[PDB]
Design an enzyme around this catalytic site. Sequence first.
Site, PDB file in Angstrom:
ATOM      1  N   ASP A  11       0.856  -1.180   0.000  1.00 51.44           N
ATOM      2  CA  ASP A  11       0.000   0.000   0.000  1.00 51.44           C
ATOM      3  C   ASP A  11       0.911   1.255   0.000  1.00 51.44           C
ATOM      4  O   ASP A  11       0.791   2.164   0.822  1.00 51.44           O
ATOM      5  CB  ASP A  11      -0.932  -0.001   1.196  1.00 51.44           C
ATOM      6  CG  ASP A  11      -1.646  -1.298   1.363  1.00 51.44           C
ATOM      7  OD1 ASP A  11      -2.093  -1.888   0.344  1.00 51.44           O
ATOM      8  OD2 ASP A  11      -1.724  -1.819   2.489  1.00 51.44           O
ATOM      9  N   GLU A 191     -11.149  -1.567  -3.358  1.00 52.67           N
ATOM     10  CA  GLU A 191     -10.469  -0.888  -2.245  1.00 52.67           C
ATOM     11  C   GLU A 191      -9.322  -0.030  -2.811  1.00 52.67           C
ATOM     12  O   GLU A 191      -9.229   0.155  -4.014  1.00 52.67           O
ATOM     13  CB  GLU A 191     -10.013  -1.937  -1.197  1.00 52.67           C
ATOM     14  CG  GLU A 191      -8.942  -2.895  -1.728  1.00 52.67           C
ATOM     15  CD  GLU A 191      -8.582  -3.990  -0.754  1.00 52.67           C
ATOM     16  OE1 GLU A 191      -9.219  -4.148   0.326  1.00 52.67           O
ATOM     17  OE2 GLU A 191      -7.608  -4.706  -1.079  1.00 52.67           O
ATOM     18  N   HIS A 255      -3.082  -1.572  -4.912  1.00 54.91           N
ATOM     19  CA  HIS A 255      -3.175  -0.415  -3.980  1.00 54.91           C
ATOM     20  C   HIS A 255      -2.138   0.606  -4.323  1.00 54.91           C
ATOM     21  O   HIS A 255      -1.161   0.791  -3.645  1.00 54.91           O
ATOM     22  CB  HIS A 255      -3.205  -0.756  -2.512  1.00 54.91           C
ATOM     23  CG  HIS A 255      -3.697   0.374  -1.665  1.00 54.91           C
ATOM     24  ND1 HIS A 255      -4.294   0.175  -0.447  1.00 54.91           N
ATOM     25  CD2 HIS A 255      -3.753   1.718  -1.898  1.00 54.91           C
ATOM     26  CE1 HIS A 255      -4.615   1.352   0.074  1.00 54.91           C
ATOM     27  NE2 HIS A 255      -4.281   2.313  -0.769  1.00 54.91           N
ATOM     28  N   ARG A 289       4.881  -8.455  -0.480  1.00 54.91           N
ATOM     29  CA  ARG A 289       4.483  -7.420  -1.428  1.00 54.91           C
ATOM     30  C   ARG A 289       5.539  -6.316  -1.369  1.00 54.91           C
ATOM     31  O   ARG A 289       5.808  -5.748  -0.286  1.00 54.91           O
ATOM     32  CB  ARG A 289       3.099  -6.871  -1.079  1.00 54.91           C
ATOM     33  CG  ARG A 289       2.012  -7.877  -1.334  1.00 54.91           C
ATOM     34  CD  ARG A 289       0.655  -7.495  -0.839  1.00 54.91           C
ATOM     35  NE  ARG A 289       0.634  -7.367   0.615  1.00 54.91           N
ATOM     36  CZ  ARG A 289      -0.354  -6.770   1.289  1.00 54.91           C
ATOM     37  NH1 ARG A 289      -1.436  -6.296   0.672  1.00 54.91           N
ATOM     38  NH2 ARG A 289      -0.221  -6.645   2.594  1.00 54.91           N
TER      39      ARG A 289
HETATM   40 MG   LIG Z   1      -4.227   4.555  -0.480  1.00 50.62          MG
END
Ligand SMILES: [Mg+2]
Length: 314
Positions: A11, A191, A255, A289
């Site tokens: 993220d 998301e 993300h 990730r």
């Molecule tokens: Mg964000």
Amino acid sequence: ILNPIIIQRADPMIYKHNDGYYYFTASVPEYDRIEVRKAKTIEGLRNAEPVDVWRRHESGEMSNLIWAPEIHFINGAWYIYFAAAPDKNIEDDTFNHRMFVIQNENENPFTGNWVEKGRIKTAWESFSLDATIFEHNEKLYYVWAQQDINIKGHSNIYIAEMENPWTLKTKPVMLTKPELEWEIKGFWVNEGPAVLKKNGKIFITYSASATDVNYCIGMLTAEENSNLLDKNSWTKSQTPVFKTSMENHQYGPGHNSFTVSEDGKHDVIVYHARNYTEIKGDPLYDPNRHTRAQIINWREDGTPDFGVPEVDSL
Ligand SMILES: [Mg+2]
Ligand SMILES: [Mg+2]
Ligand SMILES: [Mg+2]
Ligand code: NA
């Protein structure tokens, strides 16, 4: 750009400030704190020393699963928007995250002046996460993921206008829900919204499906002077704008955030992906990730071409 930039950070959010420097935060694999680092260049972030500016509470609302911070600078102050849960219970098929923000009015965000504004309330209470912010015509907008029990799946993307950087002044307006085949693999998810303004348009990318090989990025597009709080202003891309590259061994890109190159000439997509596919354990606790960045190309029609996730350079 030599990828990955930073290993084991999900993220990823890079913010280019007006002091020259890039500031980066992300989800750490322990999901227990908000880390920030600074460098003069994007690739400089690899070697920049991270600082934990905020740590989870022992108990109660900001105590668990600290997720997806974003660092922003609004009206002279720093804000970091993040999600947290009171425990790891699953209710209505999802964790029970809510959304928070910490503020630092000092010029230097590494100073110990972070204030909890608390909980950013929306029109109902359910799993909520991954908030981002953008401005258009002197209005401030909040864009986030939240579950609605009456809409199938784990989370939809909403927009609302803000009174101030911690307070909404409108209802949520749903812009996308998971529904296309590439949005519903593993789990039905929308998301990780991120906002890019260019060519008289506003683009809201978002991620969909589970956080494994199937993770990918979709997109909504509006004309910048349309009614942004009307769903009908937003066109939903029919196919992913960014997805797994089997040929480049980059799996489940998503993300994302957006920044610009050192010289200000190019837009940059900043995202995470894995470089292997068989996770063999709960993906939430697989830490691999990695944070990656690439230049965005622009088509003749003014739309962005993100290309494919590029091969690792190292
Ligand atoms: Mg964000
Ligand atoms: Mg600014
Ligand atoms: Mg249910
Ligand atoms: Na939930």
